[PDB]
Amino acid sequence: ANTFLVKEDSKNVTAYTPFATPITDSKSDLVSLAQLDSSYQIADQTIHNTNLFVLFKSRDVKVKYESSGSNNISFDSTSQGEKPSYVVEFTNSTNIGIKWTMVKKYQLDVPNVSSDMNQVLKNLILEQPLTKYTLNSSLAKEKGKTQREVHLGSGQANQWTSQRNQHDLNNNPSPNASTGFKLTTGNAYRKLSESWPIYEPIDGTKQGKGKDSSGWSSTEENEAKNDAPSVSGSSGTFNKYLNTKQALESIGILFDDQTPRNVITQLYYASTSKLAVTNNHIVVMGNSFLPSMWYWVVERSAQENASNKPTWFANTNLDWGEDKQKQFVENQLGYKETTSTNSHNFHSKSFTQPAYLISGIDSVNDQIIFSGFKAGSVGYDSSSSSSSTKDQALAWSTTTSLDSKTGYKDLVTNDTGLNGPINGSFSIQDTFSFVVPYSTTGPIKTAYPVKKDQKSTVKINSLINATPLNSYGDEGIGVFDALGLNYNFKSNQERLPSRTDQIFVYGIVSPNELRSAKSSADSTGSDTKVNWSNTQSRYLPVPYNYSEGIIDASVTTFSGLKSIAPDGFANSIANFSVGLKAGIDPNPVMSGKKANYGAVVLTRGGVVRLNFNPGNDSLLSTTDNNIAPISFSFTPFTAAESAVDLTTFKEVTYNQESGLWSYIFDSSLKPSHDGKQTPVTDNMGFSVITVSRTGIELNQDQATTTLDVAPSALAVQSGIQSTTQTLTGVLPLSEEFSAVIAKDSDQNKIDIYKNNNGLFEIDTQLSNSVATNNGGLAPSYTENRVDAWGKVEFADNSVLQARNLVDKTVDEIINTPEILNSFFRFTPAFEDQKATLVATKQSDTSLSVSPRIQFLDGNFYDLNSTIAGVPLNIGFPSRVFAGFAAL
Ligand SMILES: CC(=O)N[C@H]1[C@H]([C@H](O)[C@H](O)CO)O[C@@](OC[C@H]2O[C@@H](O[C@H]3[C@H](O)[C@@H](O)[C@H](O)O[C@@H]3CO)[C@H](O)[C@@H](O)[C@H]2O)(C(=O)O)C[C@@H]1O
Numbered sequence: 040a041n042t043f044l045v046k047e048d049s050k051n052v053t054a055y056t057p058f059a060t061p062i063t064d065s066k067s068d069l070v071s072l073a074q075l076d077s078s079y080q081i082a083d084q085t086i087h088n089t090n091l092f093v094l095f096k097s098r099d100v101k102v103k104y105e106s107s108g109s110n111n112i113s114f115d116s117t118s119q120g121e122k123p124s125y126v127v128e129f130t131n132s133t134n135i136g137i138k139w140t141m142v143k144k145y146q147l148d149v150p151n152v153s154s155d156m157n158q159v160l161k162n163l164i165l166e167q168p169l170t171k172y173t174l175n176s177s178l179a180k181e182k183g184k185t186q187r188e189v190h191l192g193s194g195q196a197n198q199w200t201s202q203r204n205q206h207d208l209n210n211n212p213s214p215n216a217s218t219g220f221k222l223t224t225g226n227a228y229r230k231l232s233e234s235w236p237i238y239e240p241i242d243g244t245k246q247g248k249g250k251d252s253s254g255w256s257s258t259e260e261n262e263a264k265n266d267a268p269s270v271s272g273s274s275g276t277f278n279k280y281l282n283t284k285q286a287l288e289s290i291g292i293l294f295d296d297q298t299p300r301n302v303i304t305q306l307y308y309a310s311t312s313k314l315a316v317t318n319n320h321i322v323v324m325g326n327s328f329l330p331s332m333w334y335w336v337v338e339r340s341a342q343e344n345a346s347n348k349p350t351w352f353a354n355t356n357l358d359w360g361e362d363k364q365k366q367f368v369e370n371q372l373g374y375k376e377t378t379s380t381n382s383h384n385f386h387s388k389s390f391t392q393p394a395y396l397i398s399g400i401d402s403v404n405d406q407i408i409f410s411g412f413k414a415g416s417v418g419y420d421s422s423s424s425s426s427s428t429k430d431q432a433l434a435w436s437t438t439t440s441l442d443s444k445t446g447y448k449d450l451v452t453n454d455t456g457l458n459g460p461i462n463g464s465f466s467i468q469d470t471f472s473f474v475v476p477y478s479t480t481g482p483i484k485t486a487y488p489v490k491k492d493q494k495s496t497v498k499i500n501s502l503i504n505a506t507p508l509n510s511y512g513d514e515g516i517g518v519f520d521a522l523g524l525n526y527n528f529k530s531n532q533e534r535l536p537s538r539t540d541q542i543f544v545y546g547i548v549s550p551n552e553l554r555s556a557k558s559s560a561d562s563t564g565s566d567t568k569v570n571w572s573n574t575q576s577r578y579l580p581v582p583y584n585y586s587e588g589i590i591d592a593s594v595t596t597f598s599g600l601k602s603i604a605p606d607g608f609a610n611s612i613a614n615f616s617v618g619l620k621a622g623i624d625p626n627p628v629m630s631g632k633k634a635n636y637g638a639v640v641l642t643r644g645g646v647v648r649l650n651f652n653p654g655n656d657s658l659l660s661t662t663d664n665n666i667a668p669i670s671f672s673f674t675p676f677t678a679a680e681s682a683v684d685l686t687t688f689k690e691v692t693y694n695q696e697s698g699l700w701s702y703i704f705d706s707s708l709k710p711s712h713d714g715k716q717t718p719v720t721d722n723m724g725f726s727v728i729t730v731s732r733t734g735i736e737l738n739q740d741q742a743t744t745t746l747d748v749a750p751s752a753l754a755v756q757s758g759i760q761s762t763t764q765t766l767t768g769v770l771p772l773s774e775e776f777s778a779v780i781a782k783d784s785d786q787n788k789i790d791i792y793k794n795n796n797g798l799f800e801i802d803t804q805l806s807n808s809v810a811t812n813n814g815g816l817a818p819s820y821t822e823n824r825v826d827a828w829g830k831v832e833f834a835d836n837s838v839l840q841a842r843n844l845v846d847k848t849v850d851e852i853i854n855t856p857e858i859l860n861s862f863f864r865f866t867p868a869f870e871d872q873k874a875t876l877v878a879t880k881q882s883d884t885s886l887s888v889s890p891r892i893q894f895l896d897g898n899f900y901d902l903n904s905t906i907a908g909v910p911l912n913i914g915f916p917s918r919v920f921a922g923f924a925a926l
C-alpha cells in the first residue's frame with residue numbers, strides 16, 4: 040500500500056496519497072461495514088499482511104458483577120447494553136482504488152470467573168481513576184497505624200525491644216514504620232457493582248470518604264455537589280472538591296446522564312482499547328487511563344460466531360527480573376494464611392499482580408511486545424466490630440536500605456521491606472534519611488502488619504489503585520519513593536529503588552506464551568496459570584524537577600508537595616506511559632545475524648527504549664548483574680518535550696526507511712471543562728515528537744554480538760506543532776519532509792514541513808507548490824516554474840547536429856541514458872531531488888523523452904504512476920527529438 044490511512048472521525052477511515060490528497064471514494068464507515076450499530080466507534084487499528092484490523096467498542100455497553108451464583112461477570116441484556124467489543128479483519132477487494140470488505144469478525148467476551156477468583160472479587164475495591172486535574176493532594180490519604188501500634192498497641196516503644204521477637208519482628212528498628220493508609224477519607228474506592236463519583240477531593244487527607252460508600256451517599260456527596268456543581272449555562276467555589284465529569288468522559292468513562300456506570304463496565308470498556316496482530320493471533324489490551332485486569336488472546340482460526348475469552352493478569356506470572364522482585368509485589372498484595380477464615384485476597388488465593396496500566400501493544404515478527412505500570416494492589420482490613428487497622432489499607436515503602444552493597448542485582452534483591460514495614464524517618468548522628476540505614480544479635484526480620492492474636496478472626500481483602508503507587512500514606516518517604524529521591528551516601532550515590540511503587544513492566548511474548556494465555560482463559564472449573572518468561576520490571580519514578588520546594592539540608596508530604604508539572608497533569612507523583620510501538624532497524628546487521636528491532640514508549644519526563652535480541656526473540660541481557668537489565672534505557676525529555684500534554688496522545692507511527700517513530704498529539708482531545716468547570720480554551724492545535732535510536736546496536740561487527748551498554752532512544756519535539764489549526768493527519772513522507780493536513784476554519788489545507796539539521800520548519804513555497812493540485816491527486820506541473828517537480832528545460836533539437844548525435848541511431852541513443860540526461864537541465868525544488876528522462880521510440884528517425892522526477896517522499900513519478908492503482912495523470916511533458924540516423 041503506497042497510501043496512508045487517516046481516521047477522519049470515530050467511524051471513517053480515508054486513504055491518502057503522498058500528495059496529502061484523499062483517494063476518491065476511499066472514505067469508509069468501518070463501523071457500518073462491520074455490521075455494528077451507530078453506538079460503536081474505532082478504538083485502534085493496524086495493518087498486517089496488507090489487511091486492516093480494527094478494534095471497535097460501544098458507548099451502550101453495560102457490564103454487571105453479581106457476587107453469588109458463578110457466571111458473575113456478564114453483559115446487561117435488559118434494555119440494549121449487550122454490546123461486546125469486536126476486532127474485525129478488512130481486506131481491500133479492488134486493485135483500483137480502495138473498497139474495504141469484511142473478512143473475519145471476532146466478539147471479545149467477558150471473563151470466566153472461577154470460585155477462587157469470585158471470593159477475591161466479592162470484596163475487591165478499586166480507586167477512582169486519575170485525571171488531568173487530580174492533584175498531589177487529591178491522591179494523598181490519611182496515615183495509618185505504626186507497626187508497633189498494630190502489634191503491641193496503645194502502649195509504648197519502651198517495650199519495643201522486649202516484644203518484637205514474640206511477633207516475628209526480631210531486630211526491627213522501625214516501630215514507627217507505617218502499616219499503610221486509611222480508607223475512611225480520600226479518593227473513592229468502589230466494588231465492581233458500584234459507581235465512582237464525578238467529584239475528586241482537593242485534600243484527600245480530609246475531604247474524601249475513601250471506601251465509605253454508605254457515608255459518601257448520605258453525607259458527603261451533597262457537600263461535594265453544593266461546593267462543585269456541574270456547569271449549566273451555575274458556578275461555585277471548589278473549596279473542597281474538583282468536579283472532573285468532562286475530564287472523566289475524555290478518558291473513556293461512560294455515563295447514564297450525570298452518573299458514571301459501574302466499575303466492571305469502565306474496566307471492560309477500557310480493557311478493549313489497543314490491538315496487535317501476528318500470523319496466529321489478535322491480542323487486545325487496555326488503555327493508559329484505567330487499570331486493566333484482563334487481556335485477550337484471540338486465535339485468528341476462531342470459528343465465525345464464537346466468544347473469545349480474556350486471560351486474567353492475576354493468572355499471568357511475569358518474570359520481574361529476579362524471584363525476590365515478584366515476592367515484593369505478591370507479599371504486599373495481601374495476608375496469606377491456612378489459619379484464617381473468609382479473609383480472601385489475590386495473595387491468600389495464590390494469584391499474582393492483578394492489574395496493569397498498559398502503555399499499549401505491538402507485533403514484530405510473530406511476537407507481541409507490551410509494557411506498562413504495575414497498578415498498586417494491596418490488602419485492606421474490611422473487619423467489623425476492636426481491630427486496630429480497621430478500614431485501613433496495608434502498604435509500606437519497600438525502598439532498598441542505605442547500607443545495601445551497590446550494583447543493580449543486589450539493589451533489587453535487598454531483603455529490605457520484603458514481608459512488612461521497615462521505612463519511615465531516621466536521624467543517625469545528624470544525617471536525616473527515610474530509608475533504613477542497614478539491612479548485631481542476628482539478621483533484621485520484617486512481618487505483615489496483622490497482629491498474631493487477630494490472625495484467625497481478621498478480614499484482609501484486595502484493592503487496586505488508579506496509579507502506580509502502592510502507598511498513599513501522607514509521610515515524607517511516600518514523596519521520595521514517588522519522585523526517585525532516596526539516595527545512598529557512598530562514593531557513587533546510586534539511587535535506592537522501590538519494588539512496589541512506580542514499577543514499570545515490559546516484555547516480549549512468544550506465540551506458545553499467547554497459547555497458554557488462551558488456555559488460562561478457556562480453563563474449565565479452576566484457574567489455569569501462564570508464565571511469560573521474556574519480561575522485566577523497573578523502578579521508574581516521575582521526575583523530581585516536575586515539583587518545587589522539597590525540604591532537606593515539617594518534612595514535605597503528598598498533601599503539601601507543590602506540582603510544576605508541564606506535561607498536562609495537575610499531579611507530579613503518579614507516572615504515566617502511552618503509545619508503545621515497535622520497529623525493525625533498517626541499518627544492516629552482519630550477515631548470518633537477523634535484523635534488529637526495538638520498541639519505544641513515552642513516560643512522564645522521558646522516552647523508554649526496550650531492546651531485543653532478534654536471534655532467539657529475547658530481552659537483551661549481558662553477563663554482569665552489576666549493570667542493570669540492558670533491555671531498558673530511559674532518556675529524559677528537555678523543556679520542549681516536557682511541555683507536550685501527554686493526555687492528548689492521538690497515534691504513533693513507525694517508518695521502516697527512516698528508522699524513526701512519530702508521536703502525534705491532538706489538543707482537540709482535551710476535555711471541554713476543568714475540575715472547576717471553567718471552559719478549556721487551549722484545545723486547538725497539535726504537536727509531533729520524533730523518536731530515534733542512540734548508542735551501539737547489536738551485531739554491527741564481531742564486537743557487537745556481546746553488549747554491556749543498553750541501546751536507548753531520543754525524543755525531540757521536531758518543530759511540527761500548532762496552537763491554531765485543527766489536525767486531520769501528519770504524513771511522514773520522509774526523514775527530510777512531513778505533510779500536515781489541517782483545517783484553519785473548515786476546509787483542509789496542506790503544509791509541508793522541511794527538516795533543517797534536525798528541526799522541522801514550514802516551507803511556504805513548497806506548501807503552495809504541493810497544495811496547487813487543481814483538484815487532481817498530485818501537484819500541478821508548470822513548464823516555466825520550479826514547482827513540486829523542480830524545473831525541466833529541454834535542449835533545442837539543434838543539439839543532435841552540434842554534438843554529431845545524428846550519426847547515432849534511435850536505438851543506440853535510447854540505450855545510453857547518460858546521452859539522454861544531456862537532453863535536459865533540471866533545477867531541483869529541494870536539495871538532492873533527482874530526475875531522469877524515460878525515452879520512447881516514435882519513428883525510425885525520432886524519439887520522445889518525458890521526465891521521471893522524485894517527490895518529497897523519495898519516490899520517482901512519471902506519466903504512468905499510480906497510487907492504489909489509480910493513474911495520477913500528473914502532467915509531465917513529452918519532447919520529440921528527431922534527425923537521428925537509421926543504420
Ligand atoms: C522508623 C522508626 O521507627 N524510626 C525511628 C528511629 C528508629 O527507631 C531508629 O532510627 C532505628 O535505629 O529512631 C528515631 O529516634 C532516635 C531518637 O529517638 C529517641 O527515642 C524516641 C523514639 O521516637 C521512640 O521510638 C523511643 O522509644 O522513645 C522516644 C520517644 O519519646 C531516642 O531515645 C533518642 O535518644 C534519639 O536517639 C530516629 O529519628 O532515628 C525516631 C524514628 O521515629
Ligand SMILES: [K+]
Pocket residue numbers: 820821822823824825826828829830831
Ligand atoms: K516544473
